[PDB]
Amino acid sequence: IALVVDNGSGMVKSGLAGDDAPKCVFPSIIGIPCYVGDEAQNKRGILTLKYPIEHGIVTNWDDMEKIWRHTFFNELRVSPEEHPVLLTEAPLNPKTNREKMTQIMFESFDVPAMYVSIQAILSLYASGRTTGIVLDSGDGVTHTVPIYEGYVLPHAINRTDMAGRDLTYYMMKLFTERGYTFTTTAEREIVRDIKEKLCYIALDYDEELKKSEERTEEVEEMYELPDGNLITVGSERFRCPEALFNPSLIGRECPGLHITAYQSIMKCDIDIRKELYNNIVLSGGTTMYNYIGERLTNEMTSLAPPSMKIKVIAPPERKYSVWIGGSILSSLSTFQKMWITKEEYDESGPSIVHRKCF
Amino acid sequence: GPMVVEHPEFLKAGKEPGLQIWRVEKFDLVPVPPNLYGDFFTGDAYVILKTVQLANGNLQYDLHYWLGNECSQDESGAAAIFTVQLDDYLNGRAVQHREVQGFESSTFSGYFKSGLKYKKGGVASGF
Ligand SMILES: Nc1ncnc2c1ncn2[C@@H]1O[C@H](COP(=O)(O)OP(=O)(O)O)[C@@H](O)[C@H]1O
Ligand SMILES: [Ca+2]
Ligand SMILES: [Ca+2]
Ligand SMILES: [Mg+2]
């Protein structure tokens, strides 16, 4: 039975092919005293926390191998020599990194077989589509990925570093504007929880801001800190994720989610754009804000030509859509000989990943 | 990404003009019995290949995957994946079509001798 490992910039999603959800989800972080995952955030005596996949591209292969060791032996508790392994990669993943992934799987873990899939492709499959534009907003990266008949359109792909991690920091800053100082690693995790639990997208930002000032009770929610004291969370609930649509709020020069989606569509052949507009698929944890689908529908309609049909698909399990797509793919009868075997790798070299995985 | 090599139904696909229909069943592509052509379980997902043989020997391919309103996510996901794989197998020359229950294209409906029919139920999820 295959293992499915989605190598997220912020969270590893891992489990068993044929399950409908990943059973082991943990942070893709290293703590240098090495600690991996949750242990890395709970130890006080930590020089630095390291993100080896900070913006979706692996930068430290030794640290990545430690994360995979922790995945197999501490989390899934399996022997990698007994299982084919499906790994995920970002769109536009550099060729040498695809080769290094393959080399580590075969030479360090002795897996019998492996495969590498693009995250956005897997999310599109999980939604039951072969054509669409995937907007995958994760922790350290947001990808905008047009796909036609099963293949990404590389000239039209966009990547920005703006995603959930930036929004956690922005929420911290907004609270600082009120005298709270969430600074420590533990406090930052509390702010991340506040963000996930209480934020929402404003369909009409100017009117939601007016309500928060003049009718604060209709916006305000209390949040229970781990010591039981309550903090009031008001306009922060919608000001924080508004940065996804207006990134100058966090000092960034990249365009908002909708603008980047539009520009990607505009890089595609005019004769498939209608299909892309009717198949905007949200994936990743930072697309989980309430009302984001309706907001994006309104923005995309206003950017598109008269009478263009717009549809934003916001699947309820989309924090795990990449992984779920991989679980489906690697379960199929036809996938049985699509794996790269150890013997093929010894026969052809790491170059095999480019000829077998696309 | 490469084309499927051995699966017996892919070996059968698109060899001559005709209409070939498969149902997703527990992560596999299973042929639909001839007598059931055009009767779709709304609990399931299907893949359809229309091969048209122009009178000059050339084959034109349209791949349609049909999603019943009660099909499970493994089934709809597998239907899309199988569609891409069949296109790959036909060297990318198939035009793909997503067909949702009650919103099917008139081309897809037109394949069937007396139109599409629907029935409740289907094969259980692979999940
Ligand atoms: N319900 C939520 N609302 C808003 N953000 C969320 C929610 N759940 C998770 N996130 C955020 O999504 C990010 C994790 O998403 P994920 O898709 O797993 O990223 P990656 O694949 O890049 O590791 C985090 O920044 C997290 O705070
Ligand atoms: Ca079914
Ligand atoms: Ca094609
Ligand atoms: Mg991700």
Author numbering:
A (entry chain A): 6 to 38, 52 to 376
B (entry chain G): -1 to 125
What does the paper say about this structure?
Outliers of this functional consensus are actins of the phylum Apicomplexa, including Plasmodium spp. and Toxoplasma gondii—both notorious human pathogens.
According to PCA, Mg-ADP PbActII is less open and more twisted than the Ca-ATP form, situating toward the twinfilin–C complex and the cofilin-decorated filament structure. However, in the presence of Mg2+, the His161 side chain adopts a different conformation in PbActII than that seen in any of the structures of PfActI and most other gelsolin-bound structures in the PDB.
